């Protein structure tokens, strides 16, 4: 009955460091992890997956190294995405895209174009994403409303933010999965979360595998409302 | 700030109902066994240096019942009260009572506690929103000036010490709607334990995994 799971995913660094490896074999390892994980949730009936890439804080990073970054994010989409549109894969980038570099904007703009029209397992990466911000655009948008004279204070309610504020139209988050040991949820997703089952684990995100994601839905299952 | 580093805990009291039908009773013994709860706990947080206390009391008689009889107690305790909440809809009575007893504790300088009677997070955030939005409509606001600093400055205790702690007895994994906008960064404690039985090592324990955090 697990519909929508959201996951952040902490313990590359670690999991490198623990194995005598430079930190980009942890992001490798990583990626990996994350595959395996998109193609478990749609093997087994899960409709969205969102996972957490990073917040809008700034990158301990020179410049040059920051727009190698972007264009090496221009390539994993490129290289990636038709295989996710076999694979029916509905790819959506949540959070502020006005903060990446007009080439990278285009490009997921076009991977998103591309399997919008899918009804497979909808994957959505949060990147540049945080919660508190997702709720202050969908108030923004309400006040410009009711600046225009189209909207009464007293008439916002719980449900009309509701549709101002990310994901609205799939289903409510039903677990969060954070990986890495810490108890937080460090302003991922919260208008969301409100009744979402959570689920902290110590094991590092490139281990993190099958079995896991079934311990965490088990944890789902045997929840009591 | 005392060692521990803590300055405002939240909790979610479940499971007065079970630790009560274990026992053969009737869920009114456990919620009675529940406040004898809260009344240790709020003792051990005014003697371990908290600064607030944040108890999610319902999203109507033992509320009315405990104003009537412990605003005595917390006011001889230095404990500032305040009930958070939407409290436009309890009976004129109740509000008054309401209000009678935070002027009283208004002044004190001790661990302030509240009360979250008729609360829901989203709702907080909603109450938030409107007020930005009275704002936009008298012209005093526009709308691209909202940020997140500004929608802090107007969701419930906003002036106290940002939460971190979030503790929930009772043995579910969730926030059911508590704070929300407030435990961004909270770390949150989940326990097995009933309320009634949450003891003075358990609130220890909680924060010592406060402490722990990375
Ligand atoms: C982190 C990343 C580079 C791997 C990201 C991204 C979004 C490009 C991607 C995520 C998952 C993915 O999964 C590939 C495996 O197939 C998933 C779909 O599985 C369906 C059934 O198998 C490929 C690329
Ligand atoms: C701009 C973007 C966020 C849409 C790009 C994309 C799809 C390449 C990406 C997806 C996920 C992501 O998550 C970062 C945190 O991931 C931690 C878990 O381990 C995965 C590490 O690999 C992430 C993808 O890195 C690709 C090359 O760098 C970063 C970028
Ligand atoms: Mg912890
Ligand atoms: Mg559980």
Redesign the interface.
Known sequence: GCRHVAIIMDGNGRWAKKQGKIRAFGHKAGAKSVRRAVSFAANNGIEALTLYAFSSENWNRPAQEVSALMELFVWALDSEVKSLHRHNVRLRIIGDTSRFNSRLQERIRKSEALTAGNTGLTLNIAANY????D??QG??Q???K??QGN????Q???EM??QHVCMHELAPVDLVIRTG???????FL??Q????????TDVLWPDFDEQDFEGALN?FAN??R
């Open positions: 945080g919660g508190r911000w709720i202050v108030v923004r309400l006040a410009e009711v600046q909207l009464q204070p007293d916002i309610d719980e933010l509701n040991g810490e108890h937080r949820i460090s302003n919260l208008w979360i409100a009744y979402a089952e959570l689920y902290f944890a929840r009591e």
